[PDB]
Amino acid sequence: GCCSYPPCFATNPDC
Numbered sequence: 001g002c003c004s005y006p007p008c009f010a011t012n013p014d015c
Contacts, residue, residue: 003015
């Protein structure tokens with residue numbers, strides 16, 4: 001998962 005990449009985590013802050 002791209003959870004360790006800011007913009008991706010921005011769409012998934014729940015990670």
